[PDB]
Amino acid sequence: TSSVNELENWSKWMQPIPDSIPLARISIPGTHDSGTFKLQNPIKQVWGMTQEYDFRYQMDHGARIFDIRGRLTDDNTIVLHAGPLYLYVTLHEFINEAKQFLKDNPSETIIMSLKKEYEDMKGAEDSFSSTFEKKYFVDPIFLKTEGNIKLGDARGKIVLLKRYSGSNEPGGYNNFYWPDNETFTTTVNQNANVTVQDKYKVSYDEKVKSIKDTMDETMNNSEDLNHLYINFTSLSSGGTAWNSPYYYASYINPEIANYIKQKNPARVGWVIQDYINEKWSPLLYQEVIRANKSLI
Ligand X SMILES: O[C@H]1[C@H](O)[C@H](O)[C@H](O)[C@@H](O)[C@H]1O
Interface residues with ligand X (CB under 6 A) are 180, 198, 200, 236
- How many CA within 13 A on the CB side of residue 70? 29
- Buried-state track 21-43, b at ≥16 Cβ within 10 A, e below 16: bbbbbbbbbbbbbbbbbebeeee
Closest to ligand X by CB, 7 vs 111, is 111
Look up residue 295 and give its DSSP letter.
G
What separation in angstroms does the CA of 87 have from each of 49, 79, 111? Answer: 10, 8, 20
- How many CA within 13 A on the CB side of residue 99? 11
CB 239 within 8 A of CB 285: no
Nearest residue to ligand X by CB is 200
Give the CA diameter of the chain.
55
Q: In angstroms, what is the minimal distance from the CB of 96 to ligand X? A: 24
Closest to ligand X by CB, 139 vs 206, is 206
Closest to ligand X by CB, 19 vs 182, is 182
Q: In angstroms, what is the minimal distance from the CB of 166 to ligand X? A: 17
Q: In angstroms, what is the minimal distance from the CB of 58 to ligand X? A: 16
Q: In angstroms, what is the minimal distance from the CB of 237 to ligand X? A: 9
Q: Assign 12 to helix, strand or coil.
A: coil
Closest to ligand X by CB, 231 vs 236, is 236
Closest to ligand X by CB, 235 vs 288, is 235
Q: In angstroms, what is the minimal distance from the CB of 62 to ligand X? A: 21
